[PDB]
From Swiss-Prot, chain B:
Subunit structure: Part of the U5 snRNP complex. Component of the U4/U6-U5 tri-snRNP complex composed of the U4, U6 and U5 snRNAs and at least PRPF3, PRPF4, PRPF6, PRPF8, PRPF31, SNRNP200, TXNL4A, SNRNP40, DDX23, CD2BP2, PPIH, SNU13, EFTUD2, SART1 and USP39. Component of the U5.U4atac/U6atac snRNP complexes in U12-dependent spliceosomes. Within the minor spliceosome, which acts on U12-type introns, interacts with PPIL2 and RBM48. Core component of U2-type precatalytic, catalytic and postcatalytic spliceosomal complexes. Found in a mRNA splicing-dependent exon junction complex (EJC) with SRRM1.
Entry's localization field: Nucleus; Nucleus speckle
Tissue: Widely expressed.
The name this protein goes by in its record: Pre-mRNA-processing-splicing factor 8
Residues of the full protein shown: 502 to 612 of 2335
Associated disorder: Retinitis pigmentosa 13: A retinal dystrophy belonging to the group of pigmentary retinopathies. Retinitis pigmentosa is characterized by retinal pigment deposits visible on fundus examination and primary loss of rod photoreceptor cells followed by secondary loss of cone photoreceptors. Patients typically have night vision blindness and loss of midperipheral visual field. As their condition progresses, they lose their far peripheral visual field and eventually central vision as well.
Cysteines joined through disulfide linkages: none
Organism domain of life: Eukaryota
UniProtKB/Swiss-Prot annotation, chain C:
Keywords assigned by UniProt, alphabetized: Acetylation, Cytoplasm, Isopeptide bond, Metal-binding, mRNA processing, mRNA splicing, Nucleus, Phosphoprotein, RNA-binding, Spliceosome, Transport, Ubl conjugation, Zinc, Zinc-finger
Function summary: Required for pre-mRNA splicing as component of the activated spliceosome. Involved in the first step of pre-mRNA splicing. Binds directly to the internal stem-loop (ISL) domain of the U6 snRNA and to the pre-mRNA intron near the 5' splice site during the activation and catalytic phases of the spliceosome cycle. Involved in both translocations of the nuclear SLU7 to the cytoplasm and the cytosolic calcium-binding protein PDCD6 to the nucleus upon cellular stress responses.
Domain of life, source organism: Eukaryota
Domain comment, as recorded: The C-terminal RRM domain and the zinc finger motif are necessary for RNA-binding.
Record organism: Homo sapiens
Name of the protein in its database record: Pre-mRNA-splicing factor RBM22
Entire protein: shown range: 15 to 302 of 420
Crosslink feature (Glycyl lysine isopeptide (Lys-Gly) (interchain with G-Cter in SUMO2)) location: K125, K135, K276
UniProtKB/Swiss-Prot annotation, chain F:
Expression (tissue specificity): Widely expressed. Highly expressed in testis. Not detected in brain and lung.
Name of the encoding gene: CRNKL1
Subunit structure: Identified in the spliceosome C complex. Present in a spliceosome complex assembled in vitro containing CRNKL1, HPRP8BP and SNRPB2. Component of the minor spliceosome, which splices U12-type introns. Isoform 2 seems to be predominant in the spliceosome complex. Interacts with PPIL2 (via the PPIase cyclophilin-type domain); they may form a trimeric complex with HSP90.
Role, per record: Involved in pre-mRNA splicing process. As a component of the minor spliceosome, involved in the splicing of U12-type introns in pre-mRNAs.
Shown segment, full-protein numbering: 217 to 364 of 848
Protein name stated in the entry: Crooked neck-like protein 1
Each HAT repeat, start to end: 6-38, 40-72, 74-106, 108-139
Location of the protein in the cell: Nucleus; Nucleus speckle
Organism: Homo sapiens
Similarity comment text for this entry: Belongs to the crooked-neck family.
Swiss-Prot record, chain H:
Main location, first listed in the record: nucleus
Molecular functions per Gene Ontology: mRNA binding; RNA binding
Protein name per its UniProtKB record: Pre-mRNA-processing factor 17
Biological process according to GO: embryonic brain development; mRNA splicing, via spliceosome
Keyword presence, RNA-binding: no
GO cellular component: catalytic step 2 spliceosome; nuclear speck; nucleoplasm; U2-type catalytic step 2 spliceosome
Subunit and partners: Component of the pre-catalytic and catalytic spliceosome complexes. Component of the postcatalytic spliceosome P complex. Interacts with PPIL1; this interaction leads to CDC40 isomerization.
Protein's UniProt keywords contain Repeat: yes
Annotated stretches, region: Disordered: 135-158
Keywords for the protein's UniProt record, in alphabetical order: Disease variant, Intellectual disability, mRNA processing, mRNA splicing, Nucleus, Phosphoprotein, Repeat, Spliceosome, WD repeat
Compartments where located: Nucleus; Nucleus speckle
Superkingdom of the organism of origin: Eukaryota
Length: 299, 111, 288, 55, 97, 148, 49, 158
RNA sequence: GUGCUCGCUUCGGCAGCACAUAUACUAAAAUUGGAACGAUACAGAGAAGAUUAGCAUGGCCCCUGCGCAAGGAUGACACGCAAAUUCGUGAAGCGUU
């Protein structure tokens, strides 16, 4: 078990690097702190370029590029080796809640904001290529696996899937009762994990050939409290386990097959915003509003 | 007010502290009163320092009232700092002031 | 000196709103009993109320097992005199100041060396529950306790500051009422507490087991059984009291007559068999 | 803890001498001795000192 | 050393009392479970949440209370059993010498 | 009652002042406790002995005076607690063992007396102690036990 | 009365260190109070001969 | 199963089944309400929260203005959220907070205004009195007499 | 409350949006107790004859002093029928087996 203090404020997001050897953490302090996973878990960055809260972190699939969506209306792209802010996408009129970069090349990025716009990008160009206008605020976006689709969840409860080729809404999924704070797509690309404020975590069949009712599995046991934070969700790399942020200070991991809890680990003092799995070894980190990151082995 | 309150708190009300920071007794004291009212050098030093401020400040008051010429004011302040021993008795309660008191005599002679 | 991070407070003092802002002042005042300095916590219990503060240190609070403010008991909310007398308990703590100081250091020594988070030394002498206490104890808050003080200028009859006035504009309690003359010390030690006396007299008037003077009948009557209670249910309950051999039931009355081998067992039986007695959701009336 | 400045010196030393001798007489006696006569031994020391000064 | 240096610091804090004002803003939240739960008492909730703020000490206020007042010292810890060997026999002849 | 309380207050103050000045002089405590014993104020006498033990628990004569006072007033269980504490703290003080058995023997608790004797033999006391235990069986003709 | 010490020894047992208590129950047994007899007792009788 | 109930500061990561499974056996009757609750200090369980400053302060303010709030407790039943207190006004006022445009906006009290600062002894900017409810209140012709009695009765004691 | 509303649409009112978002040991009081010399009568200063420097020791005794300095009568007090466990010899008279 390892404890990683040193954020002055709430930790909203944390991600392992795809090679497993290094870790990124960021939150309300606006700084992005890069940690070694092994050894003394020492720090060796301060990334300083933002002016507002860092809402989400994502690496690209090779790990050279770190993407940070911020409430400052900008998306920063960092070089992981040098720590230089490579680019500033500044196209959004309101807070940027989320981002996610494409699995396959080229280096596309998509974004969701409280202005109700879902904007696609290309890192080569300074402007948005395409904007889908949602009627209400968007809290989390991810691509699909094929990099052709944006999936967005918002405060309008429904899950909306766009197609970049037709520029049109293509299918919608209904069942969640409240704001979709978090979306995450499995490494195989078949399934999506969703967290919503209705105290349910669900798995949906994202594949083209799903049944008409796409909700395959329902998980329970997390809590959303009065702080209404954007509690995120993540998959294990093998797809056997799922984790969800919960505001009741307990760190939840479910077995996807048996639908049981497997770990419900105490020790945080605040709302847990994101939980992430290490890619190779069974190490789990959980980021909480108590200004601490907890890292520990599971079996 | 501070030194006044410190007297009244001990209920030593037979002492009087006047508006020029003299302390004088209103009667002949018993031995027991004379013991109880024997303040130490810390209290007496602070009192005489306050006296030295009032001589400075009242000179400026006399000028702002128009009772004295500006040239009289200047010679007034000069007189004070040269003569702080004679005018205030400070060196009774802290003997090391004979450094400063000599040095002001030298400056007097020099100027 | 006592330095604590959280005040021992009952729900009625603590307030009706579960979001509380309070200020922590180290060594702000002396304890109203033991005169030792303690950490004073002060908070607004609700929309209109006194903005209360802790009056006694946790040490004195631990010994009696009372809230630091109202000095009513953390288990029942009754006053100290009522709780101890109901258990026939008495406090050996000295009454004179010099001996109280000696006693104070002793308890300081004890709490520092022991676990100290516990009443159990003083509670251990009388752990038993009593039907008297459970009947009297507040099931619900008494927020009226919290209301602002009376405006003294208004009682004088020339209330300047007008309708802004946060203090109450209503008649004070009459000074001839014995309930006005209360003292924190007297409430803490539990000596001549008028609020206690009012409770105890009232509680004494509650109904009781009068029939045992019939010293050679040993049969109990129970009434209100309905048709919805079996012999076996009745027989089980009576069996916990003692040895029995008669059961007879009168269906018109819906009453049973049940006879014990001894009156002593029957009288022991009767102790439980009051208004406490419930079977199958029916509450039953017991007679001889 | 007031100090042994100057005037205290001789009275202090004569306390420490007698306090040291107290320790030795407790230890030197066999464990079955009548637990008394400590004060008697000290008075012999005070006499031996006076005889030494007077030769 | 962490245990002693902290106690050191509390002693050393006496040495210079007025070198500056202390600075204090660790305004912390604690969550509280009142033990004596009920439907009515908390207006509904099982728990209540409390904001703690350390109040600003006035630099100019003198010591409020009497410290010098001595008190009778409490009795010690309970007496240890005396593990001696048996009292070896004193003799009359040595007792006389 | 006022003259009685003033007599009590005057005497106690003189005892407490003497005790405050001469704490190591254990004989002062005994005089105060015996004076309360004369007044039959046993609850005060008890507290004086316990406080005196806190200054010098090793003083053999202090334990004796405390135990004697309880025995006289028929408070047998209080005296038992005093003896039982004494043998645990001061096992080598032979006199305590003899006196304790002597209580039980006068009370005819021949069984209870043995328990005190058996617990004594655990410490392996001096020869004379054993002979007292031997003679105990011999007084009651238990030849085969005396052998063992 | 203008004193900080004195009269306290009349209100209660002043420094009531309790007896230690164990293995025999002795909350039960208790003692006869002092026979007063304030028609023969004297100041010399309390101190003794 | 394998984890003690008397435990703190667990050095490894226990599984759900090996930490949350029941304690076996019957409860004793010898423990009152205060004794059975999992208290850390004499009246209850105190543990350090880190709740976000804007959300605490909002809900706290909301209860004082209306008398409903969203429940801060973090176990209860993990099933559905509720309001607390006068829950009838939560559904009525559509769950707003103080930091919002209110639903009710009517029957405002009337005061003077002379916002010019040019007429001496006539300016009153934000110090304006309401026009109806006015200074120097006293409560009765006869309650005065009854309070006169009470003060007189106090004079008879000393 | 102010500003903006290609707001009704006049310069009267109302609506929306933006910014602005929780002071106060809450009294101009009622109470409650414990204290300041110092006068009134009373009271007389240690060391085994007397006149006297003192330095100590001890603690629910303090005062003066910034003091880990130094004064207060050597600051006062201490002066005590200072009895703690546990026995035996020798003869003489009287009564008993």
């Amino acid at each position: 078990i390892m404890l990683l203090s040193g954020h002055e404020g709430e930790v909203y997001c944390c991600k392992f690097h795809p090679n497993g050897s290094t870790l990124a953490s960021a939150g309300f302090d606006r700084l992005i702190l890069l940690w070694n996973v092994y050894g003394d878990c020492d720090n060796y960055a301060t990334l300083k370029g933002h002016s507002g809260a860092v809402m989400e972190l994502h690496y690209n699939t090779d790990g050279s590029m770190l993407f940070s969506a911020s409430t400052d209306k900008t998306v920063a792209v960092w070089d992981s080796e040098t720590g230089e802010r490579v680019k500033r996408l500044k196209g959004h009129t309101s807070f940027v809640n989320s981002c996610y970069p494409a699995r396959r090349g080229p280096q596309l990025v998509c974004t969701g904001s409280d202005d109700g716009t879902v904007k696609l990008w290309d890192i080569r160009k300074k402007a948005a290529i395409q904007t889908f206008q949602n009627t209400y605020q968007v809290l989390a976006v991810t691509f699909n696996d094929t990099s052709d689709q944006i999936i967005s969840g918002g405060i309008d409860n429904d899950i909306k899937v766009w197609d970049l080729r037709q520029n049109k809404l293509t299918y919608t999924m209904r069942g969640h009762a409240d704001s979709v704070t978090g979306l995450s797509l499995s490494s195989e690309g078949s399934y999506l994990l969703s967290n919503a404020m209705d105290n349910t975590v669900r798995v949906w069949d994202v594949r083209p050939f799903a049944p008409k009712e796409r909700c395959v599995k329902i998980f329970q046991g997390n809590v959303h409290n009065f702080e209404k934070n954007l509690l995120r969700c993540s998959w294990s790399p093998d797809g056997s386990k799922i984790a969800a942020g919960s505001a009741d200070r307990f760190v939840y991991v479910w077995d996807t097959t048996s639908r049981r809890i497997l770990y419900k680990l105490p020790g945080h003092a605040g709302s847990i915003n994101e939980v992430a799995f290490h890619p190779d070894e069974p190490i789990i980190i959980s980021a909480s509003s108590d200004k601490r990151l907890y890292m520990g082995e599971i079996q | 007010n501070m030194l006044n309150l410190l007297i009244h708190r001990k209920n030593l009300n037979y002492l009087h502290l006047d508006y020029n920071f003299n302390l004088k007794p209103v009667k002949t004291l018993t031995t027991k009163e004379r013991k109880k009212s024997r303040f130490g050098n810390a209290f007496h030093l602070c009192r005489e320092v306050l006296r030295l401020t009032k001589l400075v400040v009242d000179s400026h008051v006399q000028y702002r009232l128009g009772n004295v010429d500006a040239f009289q004011l200047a010679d007034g302040l000069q007189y004070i700092f040269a003569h702080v021993g004679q005018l205030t008795g400070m060196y009774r309660y802290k003997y090391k002031l004979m450094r400063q008191i000599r040095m002001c005599k030298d400056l007097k002679h020099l100027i | 000196w006592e330095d604590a991070d959280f005040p021992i407070l009952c729900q009625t003092c603590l307030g009706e709103n579960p979001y509380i802002r309070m200020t922590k002042e180290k060594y702000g005042k002396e304890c109203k009993i033991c005169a030792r300095p303690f950490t004073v916590f002060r908070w607004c219990p609700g929309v209109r109320m006194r903005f209360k503060k802790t009056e006694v240190c946790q040490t004195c609070s631990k010994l009696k097992n009372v809230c630091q403010t109202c000095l009513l008991d953390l288990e029942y909310g009754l006053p100290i005199q009522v709780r101890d007398a109901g258990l026939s308990f008495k406090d050996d703590m000295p009454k004179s100041d010099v001996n109280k100081e000696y006693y104070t250091q002793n308890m300081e020594r004890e709490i520092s060396n022991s676990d100290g988070t516990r009443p159990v030394g003083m509670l251990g002498k009388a752990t038993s529950t009593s039907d008297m206490l459970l009947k009297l104890a507040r099931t619900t808050p008494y927020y009226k306790r919290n209301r602002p003080h009376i405006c003294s200028f208004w009682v004088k009859g020339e209330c300047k500051r007008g309708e802004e006035c946060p203090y109450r504009h209503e008649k004070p309690t009459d000074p001839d009422d014995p309930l006005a003359d209360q003292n924190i010390k007297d409430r803490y030690y539990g000596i001549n507490d008028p609020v206690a006396d009012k409770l105890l007299k009232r509680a004494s008037t509650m109904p009781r087991l009068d029939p045992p003077e019939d010293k050679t009948i040993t049969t109990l009557y129970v009434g209100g059984l309905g048709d919805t209670i079996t012999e076996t249910d009745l027989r089980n309950h009576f069996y916990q009291f003692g040895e029995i051999r008669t059961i007879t039931v009168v269906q018109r009355q819906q009453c049973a007559f049940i006879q014990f081998a001894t009156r002593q067992a029957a009288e022991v039986a009767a102790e439980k068999s009051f208004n406490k007695l419930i079977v199958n959701g029916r509450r039953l009336n017991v007679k001889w | 803890a007031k100090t042994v400045t100057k005037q205290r010196v001789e009275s202090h030393f004569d306390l420490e001498l007698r306090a040291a001798v107290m320790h030795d007489i407790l230890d030197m006696m066999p464990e079955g001795i009548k637990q008394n006569k400590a004060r008697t031994i000290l008075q012999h020391l005070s006499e031996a000192w006076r005889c030494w000064k007077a030769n | 050393r962490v245990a002693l240096e902290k106690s050191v610091s509390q002693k050393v804090a006496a040495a210079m009392p007025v070198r500056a004002a202390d600075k204090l803003a660790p305004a912390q939240y604690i969550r509280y479970t009142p033990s004596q739960q009920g439907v009515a008492f908390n207006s509904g909730a099982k728990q209540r949440v409390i904001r703690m703020v350390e109040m600003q000490k006035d630099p100019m206020e003198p010591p409020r209370f009497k410290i010098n007042k001595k008190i009778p010292r409490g009795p010690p810890s309970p007496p240890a059993p005396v593990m001696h060997s048996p009292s070896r026999k004193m003799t009359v002849k040595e007792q006389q010498e | 009652e006022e003259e009685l309380n003033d007599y009590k207050l005057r005497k106690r103050k003189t005892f407490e002042d003497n005790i405050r000045k001469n704490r190591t002089v254990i004989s002062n405590w005994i005089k105060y406790a015996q004076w309360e014993e004369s007044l039959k104020e046993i609850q005060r006498a008890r507290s004086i002995y316990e406080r005196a033990l806190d200054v010098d628990y090793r003083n053999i004569t202090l334990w004796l005076k405390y135990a004697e006072m309880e025995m006289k007033n028929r408070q047998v269980n209080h005296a038992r607690n005093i003896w039982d504490r004494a043998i645990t703290t001061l096992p080598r003080v032979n006199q305590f063992w003899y006196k304790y058995t002597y209580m039980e023997e006068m009370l005819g608790n021949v069984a209870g007396a043995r328990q005190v004797f058996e617990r004594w033999m655990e410490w392996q006391p001096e020869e004379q102690a054993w002979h007292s235990y031997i003679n105990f069986e011999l007084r009651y003709k238990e030849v085969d036990r005396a052998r063992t | 009365r203008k004193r900080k010490r004195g009269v306290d020894y009349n209100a209660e047992i002043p420094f009531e260190k309790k007896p230690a208590l164990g293995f025999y129950d002795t909350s039960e047994e208790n003692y006869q109070a002092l026979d007063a007899d304030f028609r023969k007792l004297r100041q010399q009788d309390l101190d003794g001969e | 199963v394998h984890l003690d109930p008397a435990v703190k500061e667990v050095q490894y990561n226990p599984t759900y089944e090996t930490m949350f499974a029941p304690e076996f056996g019957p409860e004793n009757p010898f423990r009152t309400q205060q004794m059975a609750a999992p208290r850390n200090m004499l009246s209850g369980y105190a543990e350090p929260a880190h709740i976000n400053d804007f959300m605490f302060e909002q809900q706290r303010r909301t209860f004082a203005t209306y008398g409903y709030a969203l429940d801060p407790s973090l176990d209860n039943h993990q099933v559905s959220a509720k309001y607390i207190g006068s829950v009838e006004e939560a559904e009525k006022n559509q769950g707003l907070t103080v930091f919002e445009t209110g639903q009710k906006k009517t029957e405002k009290r009337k005061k003077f205004k002379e916002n010019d600062a040019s007429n001496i002894d006539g300016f009153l900017g934000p110090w304006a009195k309401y026009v109806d409810e006015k200074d120097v209140a006293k409560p009765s012709e006869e309650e005065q007499k009854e309070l006169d009695e009470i003060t007189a009765k106090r004079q008879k004691k000393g």
